[PDB]
C-alpha cells in the first residue's frame, strides 16, 4: 500500500504528544474521527499501529469498536529516534 | 400494413417530438424516471449507450453492443438498433420493434426453460 509522508509524521507528532489514543473499528470511513485538522484517513493509521504491533513497540486493547493502543518503552525509543530531538523532552504521560 | 400510431401519433411524429411533451405522451410510473431531477448519478452508462446509438453505421443494422443495465427506458430515438440484456449467462440476440415504446428494456428474458 501507499503511505503518504505527511499523515505518518502527523501520527508521530500526535502519538509523542499524547501517548494513548483510541480508534473506532471502521475501515470504510472518509475521515479519521478525533483528528479534525486535515483529510487524514483511518486505515493507514490502523496499518501503522499494527506495524508497531508486529514489531511489538505498542500493546493492543479492543472491546467492541474502539481499538485502544498502549505504548511501551520500545515505542518511546522509536518515537524519540524518528523525532530526531534530544531526549530532554518527555511524553505527556510522564508529566503530572 | 397499417401505419401504426403511438396511441394517436405516428413514429415520424415521435421522432419529431421531444421529452417535454413526451412525458405526457407516456405513462406515470416512469415519468419520475426522467423528471425527478438530474440524470448523472449512474447515467454514465446511459450516456455511453446514447453515443453507441448516435454513432453512424453503414446501410445495414448497426454494430452490436451489450449492456449490463436491465432497467433501461426505450425512446423513439432508441428505435432501430441492437442491445444485449445481461441474463448472467447469455446476452439475448433479439432485435426491437418500433411499437415497443413505453415498456422497459428488460421485457425480453425467459426465466429458466419451458419445463
Amino acid at each position: 500500500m501507499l503511505m503518504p509522508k505527511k499523515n505518518r509524521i502527523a501520527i508521530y507528532e500526535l502519538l509523542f504528544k499524547e501517548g494513548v489514543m483510541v480508534a473506532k473499528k471502521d475501515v470504510h470511513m472518509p475521515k479519521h474521527p478525533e483528528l479534525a485538522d486535515k483529510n487524514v484517513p483511518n486505515l493507514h493509521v490502523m496499518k501503522a499501529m499494527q506495524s508497531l504491533k508486529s514489531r511489538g513497540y505498542v500493546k493492543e486493547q479492543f472491546a467492541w469498536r474502539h481499538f485502544y493502543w498502549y505504548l511501551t518503552n520500545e515505542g518511546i525509543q522509536y518515537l524519540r529516534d524518528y523525532l530526531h530531538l534530544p531526549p530532554e523532552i518527555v511524553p505527556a504521560t510522564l508529566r503530572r | 400494413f397499417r401505419k401504426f400510431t403511438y396511441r394517436g401519433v405516428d413514429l415520424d411524429q415521435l421522432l419529431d417530438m421531444s421529452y417535454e411533451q413526451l412525458m405526457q405522451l407516456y405513462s406515470a410510473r416512469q415519468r419520475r424516471r426522467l423528471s425527478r431531477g438530474l440524470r448523472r448519478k449512474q447515467h454514465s452508462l446511459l450516456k455511453r449507450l446514447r453515443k453507441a446509438k448516435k454513432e453512424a453505421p453503414p446501410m445495414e443494422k448497426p454494430e452490436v453492443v451489450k449492456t449490463h443495465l436491465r432497467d433501461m427506458i426505450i425512446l423513439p430515438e432508441m428505435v432501430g438498433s441492437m442491445v444485449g440484456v445481461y441474463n448472467g449467462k447469455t446476452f439475448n440476440q433479439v432485435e426491437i420493434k418500433p411499437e415497443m415504446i413505453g415498456h422497459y428494456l428488460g421485457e425480453f428474458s425467459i426465466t429458466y426453460k419451458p419445463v
Binding site: E18, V20, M21, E34, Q61, A63, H66, T93, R96 | -
Partner: protein, 112 residues
C-alpha cells in the same frame, strides 16, 4: 461500555465492578478492585493514561474526570474477583479439583 472495558483490561489485578457517579463539572468515578498496587503503575501514570483514554474516547472536556481506586474489604465476598482468582489458579499449572476445594474453603471460612 466502561464496565466491559474494565473487565477486558483490569482483569489482571482482580477487578470486580463499577458504579459511576454523574455530577456536572466533576465526573467522579469509583472502581472496585482487589490489587490496588497494580492499578496505579509507577506513581500514577496508569490512572492518568486511562483518564486520557476516556477523554479521547467519549468526547469530554479535558481535565474534568478523575479516576479512583481502593482496596476492597472482605474480598472473598465479591464473586467476580474470586472467579478471576480461580482463573489465575487454573491458568498456570494447577489441577482443577484441589483449586475448587481451596476456593470453597476460602469462601466458607471467609464468612459466607
Amino acid at each position: 461500555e466502561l464496565n466491559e472495558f474494565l473487565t477486558r483490561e483490569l482483569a489482571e489485578d482482580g477487578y470486580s465492578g463499577v458504579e459511576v457517579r454523574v455530577t456536572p463539572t466533576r465526573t467522579e468515578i469509583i472502581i472496585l478492585a482487589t490489587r490496588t498496587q497494580n492499578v496505579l503503575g509507577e506513581k500514577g501514570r496508569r490512572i492518568r493514561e486511562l483518564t486520557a483514554v476516556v477523554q479521547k474516547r467519549f468526547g469530554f472536556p479535558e481535565g474534568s474526570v478523575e479516576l479512583y481506586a481502593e482496596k476492597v474489604a472482605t474480598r472473598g465476598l465479591c464473586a467476580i474477583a474470586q472467579a478471576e482468582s480461580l482463573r489465575y489458579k487454573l491458568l498456570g499449572g494447577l489441577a482443577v479439583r484441589r483449586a475448587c476445594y481451596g476456593v470453597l474453603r476460602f469462601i466458607m471460612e471467609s464468612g459466607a
